[PDB]
Amino acid sequence: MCGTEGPNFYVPFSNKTGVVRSPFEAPQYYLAEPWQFSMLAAYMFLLIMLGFPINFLTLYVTVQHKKLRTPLNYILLNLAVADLFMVFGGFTTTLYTSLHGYFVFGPTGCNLEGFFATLGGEIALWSLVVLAIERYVVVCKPMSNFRFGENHAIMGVAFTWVMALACAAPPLVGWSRYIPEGMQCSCGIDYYTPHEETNNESFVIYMFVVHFIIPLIVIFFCYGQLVFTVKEAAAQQQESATTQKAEKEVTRMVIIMVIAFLICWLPYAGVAFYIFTHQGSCFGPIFMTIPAFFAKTSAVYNPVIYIMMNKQFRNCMVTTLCCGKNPL
Ligand SMILES: O=C(Cc1ccc(Cl)cc1)N1CCC2(CC1)Oc1ccccc1O2
Numbered sequence: 001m002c003g004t005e006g007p008n009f010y011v012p013f014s015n016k017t018g019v020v021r022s023p024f025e026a027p028q029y030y031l032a033e034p035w036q037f038s039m040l041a042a043y044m045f046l047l048i049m050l051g052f053p054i055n056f057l058t059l060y061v062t063v064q065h066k067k068l069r070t071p072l073n074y075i076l077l078n079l080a081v082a083d084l085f086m087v088f089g090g091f092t093t094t095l096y097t098s099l100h101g102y103f104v105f106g107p108t109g110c111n112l113e114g115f116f117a118t119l120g121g122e123i124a125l126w127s128l129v130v131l132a133i134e135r136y137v138v139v140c141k142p143m144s145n146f147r148f149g150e151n152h153a154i155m156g157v158a159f160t161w162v163m164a165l166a167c168a169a170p171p172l173v174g175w176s177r178y179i180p181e182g183m184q185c186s187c188g189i190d191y192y193t194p195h196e197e198t199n200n201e202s203f204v205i206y207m208f209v210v211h212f213i214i215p216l217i218v219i220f221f222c223y224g225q226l227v228f229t230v231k232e233a234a235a236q237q238q239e240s241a242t243t244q245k246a247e248k249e250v251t252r253m254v255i256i257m258v259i260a261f262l263i264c265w266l267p268y269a270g271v272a273f274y275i276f277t278h279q280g281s282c283f284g285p286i287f288m289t290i291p292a293f294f295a296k297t298s299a300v301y302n303p304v305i306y307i308m309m310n311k312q313f314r315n316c317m318v319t320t321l322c323c324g325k326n327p328l
Pocket residue numbers: 125189191204207208211212215261264265266268269271272275295
């Protein structure tokens with residue numbers, strides 16, 4: 001008796017007092033004080049004011065600068081579009097529902113916001129995986145007579161859409177489901193109930209293996225071999241100071257990306273290990289959704305790491321903002 005069950009929800013609050021209401025009908029001010037709902041709204045507002053300009057500016061400066069429109073950058077545009085799905089499909093609706101105290105859009109809007117907010121975050125995750133594979137193929141050259149062109153970059157972007165749909169669509173057709181999560185103002189995959197009618201247990205395993213373990217292994221391998229190949233080639237040219245300088249900056253950048261991926265990855269692993277063991281207590285209307293609360297920020301720091309620190313995008317964004325010029 002941890003929470004309260006309904007046909008389309010699970011409110012993480014005991015019902016011995018008879019105060020629980022459907023998160024589609026009445027505010028959930030027993031999960032959290034009204035100011036805690038407002039702080040959720042403020043956090044959504046922060047993500048919107050930082051997420052939309054950075055990600056929209058990425059799409060905009062690509063239009064005004066021809067040198068950005070290379071095939072190896074196509075997957076970066078896919079990342080910026082994915083974050084805009086998170087910004088508009090997830091953060092915006094949550095900011096609206098949070099100020100009511102409950103998900104005012106009903107169960108139909110729960111599937112919609114759940115899908116798009118999950119789709120955007122899933123496109124972003126696999127865009128990072130695809131970019132790691134692309135950089136690995138271009139640098140380590142595992143195929144003897146291979147050149148990465150426009151057709152290959154399109155496959156990689158289209159591949160992210162298949163992977164993201166592979167995660168976001170099954171809950172719409174009966175494998176897992178979309179329910180209000182945490183404070184019941186946004187919607188997402190049901191990791192909180194063992195809903196046997198939709199086989200939630202198998203979907204969590206599938207999510208954990210395919211959309212959690214596999215992305216980590218691919219990123220670590222590709223960048224691992226990449227830094228290995230770069231350091232190996234740089235060792236053969238120790239007389240070139242720029243080669244050593246290029247090797248040092250490639251190492252620092254791969255580290256930054258791998259660390260940034262783990263900052264979004266480890267919270268789920270920490271919640272996993274606490275759910276893997278300790279399977280005997282109620283997770284409050286918050287605990288299990290703490291990784292989600294911080295994984296949203298990937299809509300802000302991923303374009304900062306992968307785009308704003310790209311040498312090309314930075315100068316072009318300065319040029320666009322710058323008007324025309326820029327300090328040289
Ligand atoms: O939705 C995503 C997609 C994603 C993928 C990578 C990152 Cl870095 C962030 C989000 N998550 C991952 C897999 C998932 C669900 C949440 O399954 C779990 C089962 C047990 C414990 C934690 C779990 O996390």
